[PDB]
């Protein structure tokens, strides 16, 4: 009875030949709002496409929110340099051909860039207005791995500046081309109503698009 012991969901998905999504989680745990988001990232990107790297050395399995083990989230406290010696399976992570997402870079991602870079990288960040520019850790953590790419000159949420990349590498629509709201006003009543300031982008209804569940927890926050 050793048959369960396998990497059966590995050996499905490969050969790799795919961008992957790179999450370096800089947040301490993991709070609903996290969970929303990276929930969504998942389904949007397919749980073989992202990684959720660089977790505090002690963390178990039990410390991961089973929704996300539940939606198939590949995690580990190996850094970036390490993510090849846990996930033997993945491309190597070689220099330059991995782009850092900097909200301070002076040249933006554009879909030719598809060609240049095998993984793209994002703070696990909940931002604040203004930025307080963590992602530089990032950038000084890796001097020689990353290339620095920008996406627009407003702040975007950790899910939605994948969502915009995935856009711009996978589907090769020119950032110009995206339509995006920038700092959009949540109204629900005439005594409740919140902006949230990042920009995000529209769906085809016009409306911002954010992970399932966040917007009544934004009610839920409106109604205290
Ligand atoms: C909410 S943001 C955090 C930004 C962080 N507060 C800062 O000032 O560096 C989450 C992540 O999405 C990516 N990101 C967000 N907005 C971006 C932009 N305008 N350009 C490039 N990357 C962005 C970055 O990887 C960032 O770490």
Redesign the pocket.
């Given at each position: 009875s050793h048959h369960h012991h396998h990497h059966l969901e590995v050996l499905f998905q490969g050969p790799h030949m795919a961008s992957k999504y790179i999450i370096?989680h800089?947040e301490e745990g993991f709070s609903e709002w996290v969970i929303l988001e990276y929930s969504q990232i998942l389904r949007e990107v397919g749980a073989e496409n992202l990684i959720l790297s660089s977790l505090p050395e002690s963390t178990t399995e039990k410390d991961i929110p089973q929704r996300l083990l539940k939606l198939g989230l590949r995690w580990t406290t190996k850094d970036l340099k390490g993510i090849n010696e846990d996930f033997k399976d993945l491309e190597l992570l070689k220099d330059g051909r991995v782009c850092?997402?900097?909200?301070?870079?002076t040249i933006?991602?554009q879909p030719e860039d598809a060609t240049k870079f095998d993984y793209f990288?994002?703070?696990?960040?909940?931002?604040?207005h203004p930025?307080?520019?963590?992602?530089?850790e990032?950038k000084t953590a890796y001097p020689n791995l990353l290339i620095?790419?920008?996406?627009?000159?407003?702040?975007?949420?950790?899910d939605?500046?994948?969502r915009?990349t995935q856009l711009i590498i996978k589907d090769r629509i020119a950032f110009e081309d995206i339509k995006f709201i920038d700092y959009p006003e949540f109204r629900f009543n005439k005594n409740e109503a919140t902006e949230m300031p990042?920009?995000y982008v529209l769906d085809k209804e016009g409306k911002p698009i954010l992970p399932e569940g966040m917007l009544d927890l934004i009610k839920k926050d409106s109604a205290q």
């Open positions: 370096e800089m850092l997402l900097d909200p301070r870079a933006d991602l990288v994002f703070g696990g960040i909940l931002g604040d930025p307080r520019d963590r992602t530089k990032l620095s790419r920008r996406l627009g000159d407003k702040q975007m949420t950790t939605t500046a994948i915009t990042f920009r």
